[PDB]
Amino acid sequence: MTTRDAATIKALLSHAHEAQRSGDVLASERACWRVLQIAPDNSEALHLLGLLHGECGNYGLAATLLRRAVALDPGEASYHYNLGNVLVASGQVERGITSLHHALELRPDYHRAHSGLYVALHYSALYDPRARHILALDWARRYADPLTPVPATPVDPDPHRRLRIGYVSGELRCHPVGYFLEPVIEAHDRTAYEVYCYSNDPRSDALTDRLRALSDRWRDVWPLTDAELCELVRRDGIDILVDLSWHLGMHRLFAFARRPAPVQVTWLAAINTTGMRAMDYLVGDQHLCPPGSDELYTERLVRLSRFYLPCNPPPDLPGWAPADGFPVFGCFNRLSMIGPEVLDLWAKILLALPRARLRLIATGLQDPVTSSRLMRALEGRGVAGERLELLSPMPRTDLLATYNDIDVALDTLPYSGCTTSLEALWMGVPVVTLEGADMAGRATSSLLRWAGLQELVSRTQEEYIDIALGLGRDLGTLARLREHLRRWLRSVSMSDQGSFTAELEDAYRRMWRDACQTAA
Numbered sequence: 202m203t204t205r206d207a208a209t210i211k212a213l214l215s216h217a218h219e220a221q222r223s224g225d226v227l228a229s230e231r232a233c234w235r236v237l238q239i240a241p242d243n244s245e246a247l248h249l250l251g252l253l254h255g256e257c258g259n260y261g262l263a264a265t266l267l268r269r270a271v272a273l274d275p276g277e278a279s280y281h282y283n284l285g286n287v288l289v290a291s292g293q294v295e296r297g298i299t300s301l302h303h304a305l306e307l308r309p310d311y312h313r314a315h316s317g318l319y320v321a322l323h324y325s326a327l328y329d330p331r332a333r334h335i336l337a338l339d340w341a342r343r344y345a346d347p348l349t350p351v352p353a354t355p356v357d358p359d360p361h362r363r364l365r366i367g368y369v370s371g372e373l374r375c376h377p378v379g380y381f382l383e384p385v386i387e388a389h390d391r392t393a394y395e396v397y398c399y400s401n402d403p404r405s406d407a408l409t410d411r412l413r414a415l416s417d418r419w420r421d422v423w424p425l426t427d428a429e430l431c432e433l434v435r436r437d438g439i440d441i442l443v444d445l446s447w448h449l450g451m452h453r454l455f456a457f458a459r460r461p462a463p464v465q466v467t468w469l470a471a472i473n474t475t476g477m478r479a480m481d482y483l484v485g486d487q488h489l490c491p492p493g494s495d496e497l498y499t500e501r502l503v504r505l506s507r508f509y510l511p512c513n514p515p516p517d518l519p520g521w522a523p524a525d526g527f528p529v530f531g532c533f534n535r536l537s538m539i540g541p542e543v544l545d546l547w548a549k550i551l552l553a554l555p556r557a558r559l560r561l562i563a564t565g566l567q568d569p570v571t572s573s574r575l576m577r578a579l580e581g582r583g584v585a586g587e588r589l590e591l592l593s594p595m596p597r598t599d600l601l602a603t604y605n606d607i608d609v610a611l612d613t614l615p616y617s618g619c620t621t622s623l624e625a626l627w628m629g630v631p632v633v634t635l636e637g638a639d640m641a642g643r644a645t646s647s648l649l650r651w652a653g654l655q656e657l658v659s660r661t662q663e664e665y666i667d668i669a670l671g672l673g674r675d676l677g678t679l680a681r682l683r684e685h686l687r688r689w690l691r692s693v694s695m696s697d698q699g700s701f702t703a704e705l706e707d708a709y710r711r712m713w714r715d716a717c718q719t720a721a
């Protein structure tokens with residue numbers, strides 16, 4: 202006789218895939234375990250448990266589930282793809298890049314692995330701006346530019362009429378994207394603009410409920426094809442469509458590829474070009490996007506004369522403590538951003554201030570394997586591993602509150618942080634950064650320059666060290682900077698929401714004028 206197993210597995214395996222596509226993680230996981238109880242060499246279920254734990258941040262389990270899936274079926278490109286992403290996210294950038302290469306070698310038309318690879322390069326100093334640029338263009342040429350028509354003249358090209366703005370993202374939720382979009386959506390001038398949001402992910406938390414309520418129109422987009430989304434955007438009559446996700450998120454750039462709107466913009470998540478002809482504008486700022494940078498972008502750079510994001514803090518802000526070995530340095534950035542280049546500098550700072558402690562908080566630090574590897578990485582640079590204190594990730598306000606126990610924040614290179622740096626300043630903690638010759642290494646350099654704190658902005662790695670040393674020694678400059686931030690916080694709490702979105706609206710208007718104008 203034979204067994205009904207194969208049928209039971211298949212029903213569990215499709216149920217598991219539905220559960221994960223709809224957002225129900227705990228249900229997809231338990232179904233994957235049920236498959237492995239019956240058939241523990243099932244590489245499809247190993248793989249899916251791999252993804253889910255990778256999304257949850259358990260990179261230790263994730264990686265070994267995905268490596269076992271690779272061993273059982275090494276020809277399957279998607280198993281290599283997802284292993285590469287886990288490895289990059291865990292801090293092992295070069296090992297992940299290799300895995301991403303394998304996925305492309307096995308399936309040369311893998312558009313998600315090609316993006317992932319493009320993204321991954323920004324976490325490594327080994328790939329210059331020319332290499333990243335080329336790979337992006339290569340992607341666009343393959344998957345985007347074939348779909349793109351020539352720019353048509355806008356419908357009802359009235360330079361002064363009320364404009365419809367469409368925000369397209371798959372991280373409209375408790376997430377940097379959602380955090381910076383909320384103020385913009387609330388403060389948009391309804392006399393001159395109308396706000397459509399296109400949510401490209403099913404996860405709907407308290408912030409999505411707020412974004413939905415603040416939007417004029419909503420639209421849940423994840424179940425639609427790119428062609429279906431295009432005919433939806435066209436029917437809504439969107440004048441300016443905005444890519445909030447970029448290559449880093451659950452984007453919808455093949456819908457953008459077709460030019461459903463006459464003005465198409467990438468903003469907020471972008472750290473480099475999309476590579477696409479179909480993207481007209483990228484919205485940055487004057488410090489963020491350096492003078493000779495434009496040749497690196499298919500989009501036209503829009504250098505706003507303020508910081509490229511709204512800096513007003515949330516209402517539920519923990520509020521500052523009276524302060525409290527000194528000094529405690531801090532870096533609450535993703536592990537992908539903490540590689541060999543940064544660790545070399547952080548070690549040199551810790552040798553020169555032999556009592557100072559470094560405090561990292563990120564996803565993956567719950568696993569002993571990844572915290573051990575980080576401790577050992579520092580000991581190899583002559584720094585005792587006990588001086589390094591690693592913490593598992595926390596809720597937003599709980600994390601904000603732990604800045605009270607930090608004297609100075611350190612920013613990553615070559616991929617500069619952004620929202621962690623802003624969060625630090627909100628809690629009266631100064632941030633030391635390197636200004637890279639590169640948009641991806643300038644999110645903090647810009648922020649700091651626009652907030653008056655140019656003295657915390659190094660142009661060289663040895664200057665980075667010196668600034669961090671200077672702050673660890675002098676209590677006075679710390680108390681000066683803590684007050685500068687107290688005044689800045691209040692100023693930004695009051696004006697910055699409306700001040701920013703007016704400057705952005707000014708940019709949207711000039712994009713629109715120019716679209717109508719050149720039809721004459």
Ligand SMILES: O=c1ccn([C@@H]2O[C@H](COP(=O)(O)OP(=O)(O)O)[C@@H](O)[C@H]2O)c(=O)[nH]1
Nearest residue numbers: 533534535563594595596597618619620621
């Ligand atoms: O343990 C953590 C770490 C981060 N975050 C939040 O998620 C964001 C992720 O920032 P990231 O680590 O990607 O660095 P960034 O790119 O903002 O510099 C932060 O701003 C925090 O608000 C959190 O809730 N818990």
